RNA sequence: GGGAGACUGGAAUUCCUGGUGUAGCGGUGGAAUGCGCAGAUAUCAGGAGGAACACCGGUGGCGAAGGCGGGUCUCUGGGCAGUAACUGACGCUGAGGAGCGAAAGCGUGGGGAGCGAACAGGAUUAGAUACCCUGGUAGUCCACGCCGUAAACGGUGGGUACUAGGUGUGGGUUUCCUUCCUUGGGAUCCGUGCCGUAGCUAACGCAUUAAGUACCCCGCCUGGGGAGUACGGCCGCAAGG
């Protein structure tokens, strides 16, 4: 169970009020998998440096998660399949 | 390489007493575990030649340690060979 | 010459999230500044370059505006 | 060392390779 | 006669080339501003 | 038409220079080339030819109603400053100068070196 | 930037589509082949694809060598420092042998943007099977295998001990100026450069990273051509080694 930091960008079209529940049900895969803990932080509605997928603004979200490598890859795979997620990136907050 | 708990368990099992880590028995057991892990890894990454060189180095070191243990005392050599499932 | 502001006892950690801390390390063209101009140590220079690249990858810094 | 020796060796090698190329099928048929 | 040729093929290797690479007697001198670069 | 504010694009290569005054939406309304003003061969890489092309393009923009322009220079330096100066001198107000030269991030292989 | 796998980013080149838009563009020492007038080059928007990863980035890091830098994640090798807990000479070298080994090349299957052997024209020339220009196929890329060579060079085999110093730089431990911010400075261990003693060398130079002083083991040399060739053999699909 290694600690991870996940940053996602959601298209600004959707309301910021539904972002928190939508991520919350997304992280249910990591939660029920292996007794894993998240700390979701949202600072959205920022214009991007360059245009992404025909979009200039984006909603930024930072997720801090402690889970197994297989679990996190599963969450990352699911997030990219969803169309409301423009981009995502997984970091290891360990020494790496 | 192995984690601290695997090393602790192997050393407790094969060690001559509860403190030794440099006995040929303990060294050979740890090398055998490392070599098995490396062989499993190389079964997937066939083209990882750099790690294969390290595998060869470990194999040579274990062979030398076994040579020493056989020359010192043959009974210990036989016991170690039978316990670790090695050929030579 | 100059000071590695990160080796000091107050050296802030280098992250790809804090944009301003990186913006101070790139030139007006968006290029990464050299080590001799900046003055930080080799490890911190590598950390800065990696953080800048990561920030660019998530559209926090322009790719050479 | 002077490159003259390298030049002599390279000319010998080049001539031999040319000779080998000129008689490839003949050598194959005789061997 | 070989050394005298003086047509283009005989003087194409001696004509200065590049912009800053290599220097020759007839190479074009670099243009310099009035103020020191700094 | 009547386009009061437009954009000027100058492309200065090593053997030519092309000026095209452009409507800010990207449409070209008047263009002049180094070979369009009577130069050919190596003659058209000279700064004087760049000046002539810039002046011709500036005039052809001016009767179209273009009064103020911003330039986007590009290419190895041959007549860029001369072209901008001739743009100004032909009765055109030059707002901003921007160098937009395509800079690859190490992609594609350059041709082999000449000898 | 040690290696392997998977996923992924942006700039640029090319092409395709649609606007604006005209008569040149392209290329050179100078031109011509070439492209365009059936709408080119230029400019804008959109799309497809492949390859390489600007700045960071150096005589800086890692690797036995070949070599290795876009980002992330997974798996994995080695090194160094300190403590010195453990074993107690278990070391070194290594004929043969085995493995790895740039590029080119070869086989099977994909891919193919740019570059580009061969090949076509143009030009230069007395002649151009070339240099320069316009095109351009293998190849370059990927998967799995062959090949086994390089100025594969530090043209310097490996291990060990000793022999003035000075000064850069990378990694780590520590005492004292102490603000403790500071390459403060020192000491120490491990690297990597430059300059320089003694000594060595035909000389050039090397010089604590030895080409100095010695010990152990291995490879190799015995005038130049003929020739790393013939013959025989082994390996290879072949090239060939």
């Amino acid at each position: 169970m290694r600690p991870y930091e996940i940053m996602v960008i959601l298209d600004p079209t959707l309301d910021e009020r539904t972002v928190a529940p939508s991520l919350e049900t997304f992280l249910n895969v990591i939660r029920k998998d292996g007794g894993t803990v998240d700390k979701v932080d949202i600072w959205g509605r920022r214009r991007l440096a360059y245009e992404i997928a025909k979009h200039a603004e984006g909603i930024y979200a930072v997720i801090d998660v402690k889970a197994e490598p297989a679990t996190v890859s599963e969450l990352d795979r699911q997030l990219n399949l969803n169309e409301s997620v423009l981009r995502t990136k997984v970091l290891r907050t360990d020494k790496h | 390489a192995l984690t601290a708990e695997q090393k602790k368990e192997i050393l407790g099992q094969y060690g001559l007493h509860d403190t030794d880590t440099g006995s040929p028995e303990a060294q050979v057991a740890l090398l055998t575990k490392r070599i098995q892990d490396l062989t499993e890894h190389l079964k997937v990454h066939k083209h990882d030649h750099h790690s294969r060189r390290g595998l060869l180095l470990l194999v040579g070191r274990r062979r030398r340690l076994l040579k020493y243990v056989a020359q010192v005392d043959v009974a210990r050599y036989r016991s170690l060979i039978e316990r670790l499932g090695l050929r030579r | 010459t100059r000071k590695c502001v990160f080796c000091s006892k107050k050296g802030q950690t280098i992250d790809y999230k804090d944009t301003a801390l990186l913006r101070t390390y790139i030139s007006e063209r968006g290029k990464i500044r050299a080590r001799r101009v900046t003055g930080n140590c080799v490890q911190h220079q590598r950390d800065i370059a990696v953080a800048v690249k990561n920030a660019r990858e998530v559209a926090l810094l322009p790719f050479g505006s | 060392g002077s490159v003259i020796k390298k030049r002599r060796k390279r000319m010998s090698k080049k001539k031999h390779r040319k000779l080998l190329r000129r008689t490839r099928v003949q050598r194959r048929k005789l061997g | 006669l070989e050394r005298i040729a003086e047509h283009w093929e005989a003087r194409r290797g001696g004509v200065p080339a590049e912009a800053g690479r290599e220097w020759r007697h007839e190479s074009e001198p670099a243009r310099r501003p009035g103020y020191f670069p700094r | 038409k009547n386009v009061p504010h437009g954009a000027a694009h100058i492309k200065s290569t090593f053997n030519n220079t092309i000026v095209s005054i452009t409507d800010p939406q990207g449409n070209v309304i008047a263009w002049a080339s180094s070979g369009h003003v009577g130069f050919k061969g190596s003659r058209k890489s000279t700064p004087f030819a760049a000046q002539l092309a810039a002046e011709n393009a500036a005039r052809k923009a001016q009767e179209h109603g273009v009064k103020k322009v911003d330039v986007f220079v590009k290419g190895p330096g041959s007549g860029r400053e001369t072209a901008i100066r001739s743009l100004q001198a032909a009765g055109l107000e030059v707002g901003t100068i921007s160098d937009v030269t395509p800079q690859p991030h190490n992609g594609c292989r350059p041709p082999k070196r000449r000898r």
Side-chain angles (χ1 to χ4, degrees), chain A, chain B, chain C, chain D, chain E residues 1-37, chain F:
Chain A
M1 311 258 309
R2 332 168 175 199
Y4 290 95
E5 201 250 341
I6 292 108
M7 157 162 303
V8 328
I9 316 168
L10 310 111
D11 47 340
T13 88
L14 57 95
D15 187 358
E16 58 57 26
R17 274 194 284 283
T18 89
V19 181
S22 34
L23 307 169
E24 204 41 30
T25 176
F26 256 121
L27 323 183
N28 256 346
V29 51
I30 77 99
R31 211 151 16 213
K32 99 190 55 63
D33 183 323
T36 68
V37 48
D38 354 9
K39 314 99 205 165
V40 198
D41 159 50
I42 282 198
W43 44 297
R45 195 37 59 55
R46 313 174 24 123
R47 59 162 291 100
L48 319 171
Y50 53 84
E51 174 112 11
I52 285 180
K54 306 279 159 60
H55 286 128
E57 292 60 358
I59 305 178
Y60 282 83
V62 160
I63 277 72
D64 270 88
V65 139
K66 199 184 305 321
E68 269 322 336
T71 309
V72 180
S73 318
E74 182 23 44
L75 162 75
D76 201 47
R77 176 189 84 79
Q78 271 174 2
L79 272 187
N80 302 15
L81 288 190
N82 194 236
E83 74 304 27
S84 39
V85 172
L86 295 186
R87 197 173 277 171
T88 189
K89 169 83 70 203
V90 185
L91 283 292
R92 209 168 153 213
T93 70
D94 261 342
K95 165 257 209 156
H96 308 44
Chain B
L2 324 169
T3 87
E5 64 75 352
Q6 327 182 252
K7 269 191 203 162
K8 197 71 46 173
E9 174 297 345
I10 288 169
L11 288 166
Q13 177 177 14
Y14 279 66
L16 287 202
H17 47 280
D18 72 341
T19 279
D20 83 324
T21 63
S23 165
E25 279 88 345
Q27 298 200 53
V28 158
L30 289 173
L31 279 180
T32 301
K33 183 82 208 106
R34 267 195 95 194
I35 281 165
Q36 292 168 347
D37 288 8
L38 214 31
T39 279
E40 295 328 342
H41 160 82
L42 282 172
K43 217 86 55 63
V44 170
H45 314 256
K46 325 276 210 64
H47 297 151
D48 198 0
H49 301 113
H50 286 62
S51 313
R52 204 169 261 119
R53 166 146 190 284
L55 175 66
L56 271 204
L57 294 168
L58 296 191
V59 160
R61 193 177 323 282
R62 176 174 78 176
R63 197 213 328 282
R64 276 198 285 277
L65 277 163
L66 285 176
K67 230 165 168 145
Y68 169 72
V69 123
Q71 147 198 279
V72 150
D73 186 305
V74 200
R76 273 148 48 111
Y77 174 75
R78 267 129 192 189
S79 185
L80 196 53
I81 286 328
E82 76 75 358
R83 208 139 49 104
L84 267 177
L86 307 190
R87 213 187 100 256
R88 68 208 145 114
Chain C
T1 315
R2 339 178 65 62
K3 274 319 86 183
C4 176
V5 319
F6 297 100
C7 273
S8 40
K9 296 294 159 65
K10 337 281 163 182
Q12 331 88 326
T13 197
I14 291 159
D15 205 337
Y16 79 109
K17 295 202 274 336
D18 36 27
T19 312
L21 174 99
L22 309 183
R23 291 205 176 264
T24 188
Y25 279 118
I26 63 185
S27 78
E28 82 316 343
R29 200 66 57 268
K31 282 157 133 219
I32 316 178
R33 278 188 202 265
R35 189 169 95 70
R36 71 185 47 280
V37 148
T38 291
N40 41 10
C41 61
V42 278
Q43 332 197 346
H44 290 135
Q45 179 72 11
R46 294 181 218 113
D47 288 20
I48 283 302
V50 168
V52 162
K53 294 182 190 164
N54 271 334
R56 292 169 165 164
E57 295 256 335
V58 286
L60 292 180
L61 289 177
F63 263 106
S65 46
Chain D
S2 67
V3 155
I4 294 192
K5 333 196 227 192
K6 262 160 216 304
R7 289 183 54 76
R8 308 204 317 252
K9 303 224 77 148
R10 78 161 278 231
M11 182 69 89
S12 200
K13 169 153 190 170
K14 223 195 78 86
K15 253 42 180 67
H16 175 65
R17 276 301 205 110
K18 214 164 165 228
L19 174 56
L20 271 206
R21 268 276 172 282
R22 284 193 339 258
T23 84
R24 186 151 103 218
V25 180
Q26 204 244 322
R27 257 182 303 121
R28 289 217 194 104
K29 83 201 210 180
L30 76 94
Chain E
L1 290 173
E2 259 166 39
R3 284 197 235 275
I4 259 297
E6 210 255 352
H7 61 238
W8 169 249
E9 262 295 333
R11 72 209 183 60
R12 75 177 300 286
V15 161
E18 292 133 327
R21 276 320 97 220
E22 286 203 350
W23 167 256
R24 277 229 199 248
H25 194 329
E26 324 188 29
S27 200
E28 203 165 86
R31 297 309 199 72
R32 303 215 144 286
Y35 223 135
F36 166 81
Chain F
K1 68 198 93 181
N2 216 305
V3 176
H5 188 253
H9 298 104
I10 310 184
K11 159 103 167 281
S12 278
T13 92
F14 272 135
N15 24 12
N16 207 68
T17 163
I18 301 177
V19 194
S20 47
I21 323 288
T22 284
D23 155 17
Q25 333 327 312
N27 317 286
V28 169
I29 84 189
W31 71 272
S33 172
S34 191
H36 186 56
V37 293
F39 295 95
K40 26 165 279 296
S42 183
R43 217 50 62 85
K44 62 199 196 174
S45 54
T46 65
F48 177 63
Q51 170 197 27
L52 281 198
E55 166 250 335
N56 180 281
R59 284 193 317 71
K60 255 130 78 156
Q62 267 174 123
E63 74 301 27
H64 264 286
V66 169
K67 336 293 298 213
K68 189 181 114 28
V69 94
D70 45 353
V71 331
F72 301 91
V73 305
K74 157 146 118 191
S78 327
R80 294 153 47 133
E81 271 266 89
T82 301
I84 294 153
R85 281 197 280 284
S86 320
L87 263 206
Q88 259 141 333
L92 200 33
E93 220 56 89
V94 168
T96 136
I97 303 310
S98 311
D99 192 353
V100 298
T101 298
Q103 172 75 18
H105 295 175
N106 221 50
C108 277
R109 198 191 228 256
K112 68 192 184 175
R113 187 194 50 96
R114 311 170 75 247
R115 23 189 174 107

